[PDB]
Assembly symmetry: D3
């Protein structure tokens, strides 16, 4: 079954939105296959954002506090999670009714991430949940 990696970033945790974000995923019909609150090392951090090198503040913010990582599974999971999350700019791009559209104001603090493609999902799941 199709799987994607979801991260609730440190701002999502600080705003007490862990449950809200997971609920939205569940009500969409997707399942949580793996789930863990964790701290992010600079090492893990630079690997996650490797496709950004040419980027430096994403390493810093993702390490500023705990995140929640999840494997999300179900039909069309990758695109479904992107749809739920919304566009990168929470006010200019993200649609009302999305996580970013309902809950966020700025790109730098946009709460969540979902893998952007089958290839990204594969890489990110291997990085965050190696052995899954």
């Amino acid at each position: 079954t199709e799987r994607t990696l979801v991260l609730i970033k440190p701002d999502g945790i600080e705003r007490q939105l862990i449950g809200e974000i997971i609920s939205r995923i569940e009500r969409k019909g997707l399942t949580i296959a793996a789930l863990q609150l964790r701290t992010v090392s600079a090492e893990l951090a630079s690997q996650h954002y490797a496709e950004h090198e040419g980027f430096g503040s994403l390493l810093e913010f993702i390490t500023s506090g705990p995140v929640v990582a999840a494997i999300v599974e179900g039909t069309n999971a990758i695109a479904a999670v992107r749809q739920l999350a919304g566009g990168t700019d929470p006010v200019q791009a993200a649609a009302p009714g999305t996580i970013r559209g309902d809950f966020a104001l700025e790109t730098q603090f946009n709460l969540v991430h979902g893998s952007d493609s089958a290839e990204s999902a594969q890489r990110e799941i291997a990085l965050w949940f190696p052995g899954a």
Copy 2:
């Protein structure tokens, strides 16, 4: 007053979304003029999906109970379509709609609202003759 037919499909019932879907209709300012849980016969299925003349739609609509409703209010036809969302829950339906919030694939997209005044008249006459 303007009226439309709403169908909560078998997947909507199986996923315990009857209340959620009706609430969204009510909160939009529309009223429930008629409402019934029922089984769907083969002949009714083909009349409902006459424009789509297809085998999967007919097969699925008869696989379990559905909830049929007449929904009434200003701009009710277009309002129900807005609430339900586009046909593909992921590719077309907007976030904030029934399909966009709750569904993953077209074959299992939970709900139907009449697409036009002509369709509403036909579908209401079909599902609630005498209404």
Copy 3:
């Protein structure tokens, strides 16, 4: 499997709480086995409320339930009868109904308390036979 009768009274409909009430039943883990919006005749009203004929509030009960459409449902599941009574809350929405129940969250007066669920196995059998005679 255990079944009970649920009625959404005319005030429940007028206040656009049909969905909210059905959602609470569904989230509790119960299933909707039958469901219909309908008008209540005096004959139906008098039978449904027969156990109250000797009570001073009997009259108003009959006309209120006939004042507008209601939604009737068969609700099914483990402990369905007690579970529905728990969800609905006590008769007086402020003095008896707990916070978190339908009456506790949405209502103010006994005469406008939104919903009814059968009060026992015996009442459930009776009320289901009355409202849904082929069920």
Copy 4:
């Protein structure tokens, strides 16, 4: 910090949507800097409506608020949705979720920094 004026119109109050609208503003991460239920005079109404109504805003009480936060002006417009609740407003907005027609579309937020300044001075002079 950026601020904007929010009005919950008489239909918003009549439909018991005060809390729902405030919550949506709060969940977005914006703060309520000022808040007041009041009646609207014709002289006030006419000031509020000059660029663009006058009959409805005076038909019942409204709730006025100052809403503050990063990108507050555009964020409130996004939350509220387009003017026509069915033709323009997105699902997920206040108008898209709760309204049917333009004349009864529940809520208003300032449309620009200039409008916000003018409207706040009008509804909350001294703020």
Copy 5:
């Protein structure tokens, strides 16, 4: 019609619960007759809390209510006073307040218990005259 005073305390505001609390009141079927976000003066804090004069936590109550803005409201409707008390929950959010109440759902300690509703007809009349003189 029956009227009561509701205060959303500074912690209610700081935790972005203004909308949540007002929604709970509205869905109960009550109406918001007056509503104002405001700062609280020392003289006002003492008057509001007059009946707590002999309690060891008297100062603390006053010091907290002045620490930030509050929302005051006049809430109106049938059984409004008791209904608001029901919605709000008991004073200790964990030991007393029922689940499904504002305090039960959202708060952990008495000193930060989010909201207040008048506790009687006499209290509502005094508190309304205090917070909204002319209402």
Copy 6:
């Protein structure tokens, strides 16, 4: 600060209530200090439920907790232990749990009652040491 162990049981996961449960904890004002979806070994189950060993329903508790994944969490905050027990509701979801609690709102039978919170300071310390031995 006070910490407690929370378990979302296999029925809680199967019914897609992970988010709902975590949300109720967060809105109460409590923080999630640790969180993990995991499978439960027989050795773990017998240790977790050791106090029930003499009870008729002991076997059934053990079987069910190993029947599918669970979510384990450390929950932290003022009065966290009592607060979580309040949020969860009494053991029997219909006979004991209050409306407005996780069990009262979402469950029907004791055997499928969705969630667990440590019942005391002693139990919380033991349960945390068991489920999260580095915390």
